[PDB]
Amino acid sequence: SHGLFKKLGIPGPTPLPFLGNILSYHKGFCMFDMECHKKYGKVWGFYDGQQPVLAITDPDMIKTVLVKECYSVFTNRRPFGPVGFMKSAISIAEDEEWKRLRSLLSPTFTSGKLKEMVPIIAQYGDVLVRNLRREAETGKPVTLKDVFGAYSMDVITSTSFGVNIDSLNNPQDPFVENTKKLLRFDFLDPFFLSITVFPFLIPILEVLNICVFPREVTNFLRKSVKRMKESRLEDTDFLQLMIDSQALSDLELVAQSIIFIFAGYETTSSVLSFIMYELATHPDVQQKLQEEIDAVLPNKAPPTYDTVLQMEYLDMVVNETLRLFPIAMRLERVCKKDVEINGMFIPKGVVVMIPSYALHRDPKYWTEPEKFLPERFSKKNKDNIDPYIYTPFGSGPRNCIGMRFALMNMKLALIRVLQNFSFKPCKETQIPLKLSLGGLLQPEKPVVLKVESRD
């Protein structure tokens, strides 16, 4: 397989037998991708074991992959390891199985439903605020990821079966304790390295029932969803709309819910911590934002759907943080069949990969790409921004279905958090921040910050 890119005249790093290029992942996905763009230009190919991956950076070609020929060629992603029943999770499903689940779960994130969560997730804003105060008179650096973690868990749980939890103040609630494994899902463990060199071993793991998703969790939710289906509401949000529309197996319902529990927890939490790092290392941006909030919501007023979209600088700050720290790092699609996009021929079976992280830090689009500058995203400057270079939620029919929910939910956290506190660096604060060793962006060391109340 290692002769494909030579034969197609596409440049790239020299593959070793069996391994392909995987040894290059030792400097991390981010450095590997940056270095490849730098020295190969617009397009290159590499091997994840025997799997050919073709990197693209042309905004049109990108638009052809993600938008135009999605349904007909570039419809699916590549799974990593034994996935078991999670074969039917929206995120992992393929072709018609996927299209059905997407159409089915479309209506979850309508602006109507979005409006209906504001008041629910408000309740957990207050809980967050309280937890943040008690942690601040500690006078000792605060692990935000922990505090934010608790918040975003609580929010999405309620967005399914209003199963209310204090998280922090309930480390034992069956729903909290048991879902603890579903992240830390170790995206960094060598098993994913091995399984890429030995993808031929996956069907052996499937047959033995070994699954990358902990058995403990799958088992909790199958019975949880059983109960909240019958027991909890047999008299007369996401979960409901799953049952209400019943061909959707209960096993496939758990599939979606696990995707949602994970995504709703890690994304929100990790992004909010990158954002507060950036506000703490830029006090002026922090105050400027604190002023916008106080102007739009006078006297610590409660945020509403309409006021949240009203906050331009807030949007600017969130957008810019996601430019520097797009947690997905790469976008990927499997080429279903032979094609010629924008001139170049892609053969069946290649994974076409868009290196988001590199693109978000590419000099040809970004002045001082390394610096946190929200001005970049002001209404008179955002014209200069290509929606196929900046893509923190992907693009096209298979983009982040949770985009508007995430944004919304992150802002509601910020607005409540900045209404009451200010955030400042200290000793245990890592400056400059160092990124996760691998494929899902996380901080190297947990983000720790000083928190002062505003009276």
Ligand X SMILES: CC(C)c1nc(CN(C)C(=O)N[C@H](C(=O)NCCCCNC(=O)OCc2cncs2)C(C)C)cs1
Residue 349: CA atoms inside 13 Å, Cβ hemisphere, count? 7
* CB within 8 Å of 232: residues ≥ 6 apart: 161
Residue 318's nearest CA partner among 377, 363, 390 is 377
Q: Show the tokens assigned to 299.
A: 């006297």
Q: Kindly state whether residue 319 participates in binding ligand HEM, applying the rule CB under 6 A.
A: no
> Residue 12 or residue 392: which is nearer to ligand HEM going by CB?
392
Query: Which segments are annotated as binding site for heme?
Result: 400
Q: How many residues bind ligand X (CB under 6 A)?
A: 33
331-334 and 448-453 beta bridge pairing: unpaired
Q: Which of 131, 403, 273, 311 is nearest to 303 (CA)?
A: 311
- Mapped onto helix, strand or coil, the DSSP state of residue 160 is helix
Q: What is the size of the binding site for ligand HEM (CB under 6 A)?
A: 24
Among 22, 259, 316, 435, binds ligand HEM (CB under 6 A): 259
Pick the piece of the chain touching ligand X (CB under 6 A) from 163-171, 215-223, 278-286, 438-446.
Answer: 438-446
What is the H or E stretch that residue 143 is in? strand 142-143
45 binds, among ligand HEM, ligand X, none (CB under 5 to 8 A by kind): none
By CB under 6 A, tell whether 85 contacts ligand X.
no
Element (H, E) at 56: strand 51-56
Quick check: 81 binds ligand X (CB under 6 A)?
A: yes
Chain position whose Cβ is nearest to ligand X: 439
3-state class (DSSP) for residue 346: strand
- Residue 405 binding target from ligand HEM, ligand X, none, CB below 5 to 8 Å by type: ligand HEM
d(CA 238, CA 248): 14
263 counts as binding ligand HEM under rule CB under 6 A: yes
Reading the block at residue 167, the tokens are 């998280």
- Residues 152/408, Cβ–Cβ less than 8 Å: no
> Is 78 a binder of ligand X (CB under 6 A)?
yes
Show contacts with ligand X in window 210-249 (CB under 6 A).
Answer: 212
Site string for ligand X, 177-216 (x = CB under 6 A): --------x-xx-x-xx--x---------------x----
Q: Measured from the CB atom, is 275 or 451 closer to ligand X?
A: 275
Peptide bond into 404 cis (omega under 30): no
Residue 450 binds to ligand X (criterion: CB under 6 A)? no
Out of 37, 323, 330, 361, the only residue in the binding site for ligand X (CB under 6 A) is 330
Does position 48 interact with ligand X (CB under 6 A)? The reply is: yes
- CB of 8 or CB of 193, closer to ligand X: 193
Closer residue to ligand X (CB): 212 or 316: 212
Q: Facing residues of 44 across strands?
A: 55
Q: Cβ closer to ligand X: 14 or 123?
A: 14
Give the DSSP letter of residue 447.
P
When asked if residue 90 is in the footprint of ligand HEM (CB under 6 A), the reply is yes
Residue 160: closest CA among 251, 270, 254:
254
Residue 177, number of CB atoms within 10 A of its CB: 12
Instruction: Report which of 22, 66, 67 is spatially closest to residue 46, judged by C-alpha positions.
Output: 22
Instruction: Quote the Cα angle for 14-18-23, to 5°.
Output: 55
Q: Judged by CB under 6 A, which of 155, 259, 272, 285 binds ligand X?
A: 259
Residues of this chain that interact with ligand X (CB under 6 A) are: 22, 25, 48, 77-81, 83, 91-92, 185, 187-188, 190, 192-193, 196, 212, 259, 262-263, 267, 327-328, 330-332, 400, 402, 438-440
Residues of this chain that interact with ligand HEM (CB under 6 A) are: 66, 90-91, 102, 259-260, 263-264, 267, 271, 327-328, 331, 392-395, 398-402, 405-406
